[PDB]
Design a protein around this ligand. Structure first.
Ligand SMILES: [K+]
Ligand SMILES: [Zn+2]
Lengths: 31, 74
């Protein structure tokens, strides 16, 4: 259970999203 | 003055600002440079979420301070 890779994001990351959380992974694609 | 904003990917951008700039103004600058709608921006400084109607000066944000940008849907 690890926190998201994104600075100051306190969601949990997941493996499918490369250690980002789902929300940040979605924005990472958008940007 | 100039401040730094560290983003999702760990990329850091520079912004040219004034102490009297509001957080709203800062998000408008990030929208300009990055294309991100201000309503999806959350700016964090010293562990606290920053409110749109307040100024950088209000939050004791000085030249070369680094803010963290977190993106959130709705
Ligand atoms: K984090
Ligand atoms: Zn995240």
């Amino acid at each position: 259970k690890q926190r998201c890779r994104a600075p100051a994001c306190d969601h949990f990351g997941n493996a499918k999203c490369n250690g980002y959380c789902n929300e940040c992974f979605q924005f990472k694609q958008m940007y | 003055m100039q401040i730094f904003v560290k983003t999702l990917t760990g990329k850091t951008i520079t912004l040219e600002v004034e102490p009297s700039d509001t957080i709203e103004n800062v998000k408008a600058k990030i929208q300009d440079k990055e294309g991100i709608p201000p309503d999806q921006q959350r700016l964090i400084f010293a562990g606290k979420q920053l409110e749109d109607g307040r100024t950088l000066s209000d939050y004791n944000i000085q030249k070369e301070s680094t803010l963290h940008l977190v993106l959130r849907l709705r």
